Copies of this chain bind each other. A is one copy, B any other.
Amino acid sequence: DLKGTKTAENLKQGFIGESMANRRYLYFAKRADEEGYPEIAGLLRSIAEGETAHAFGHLDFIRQGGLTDPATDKPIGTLEQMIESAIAGETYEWTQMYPGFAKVAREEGFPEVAEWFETLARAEKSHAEKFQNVLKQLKGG
């Protein structure tokens, strides 16, 4: 059983890093796009597909091992559990995380960052509601 092992923690950290790598490389590719480096941009995009495969493989072992979602500590074995994990994370983000980030940005004197965090709190609330509707569809049959 993977539960409680260092390998379980390493799969989680692997997933975090691969997730960031895909985002980072696609963001970098947009800079190459604008500056006129299509071969560099294309390489960044192709490497990013590698990082997708790596992240998804980590999630495969996590799920096969009975481990929980790195982002929420909720099970992700079935589709319903996956949607329940999405709801749990989104609910935390709109009710707690992004409002708290916005308050801190305001208190530190960064009103534009605070406004961004408030936009994201509203967006994650919308995401949460959409996922809640998906769960009603699945559990209702």
Contact = CB atoms under 8 A, between A and B. Distances in A.
Contacts of A25: 86
Interface residues of A, number: 68
B20 A71 contact: yes
Contact of A7 (B55, B83, B105, B127): B105
A60 to B, nearest CB: 9
A50 B123 contact: yes
Contact of A20 (B6, B19, B82): B19
A108 B57 CA distance: 19
Interface of A: 2, 5-7, 10-11, 14-28, 30-32, 35, 37, 40, 43-44, 47, 50, 52, 54-57, 59, 61, 65, 69-71, 76, 79, 82-83, 85-86, 89, 93, 97-98, 101, 104-105, 108, 110, 113, 116-117, 120, 123, 127, 130-131, 134, 137-138
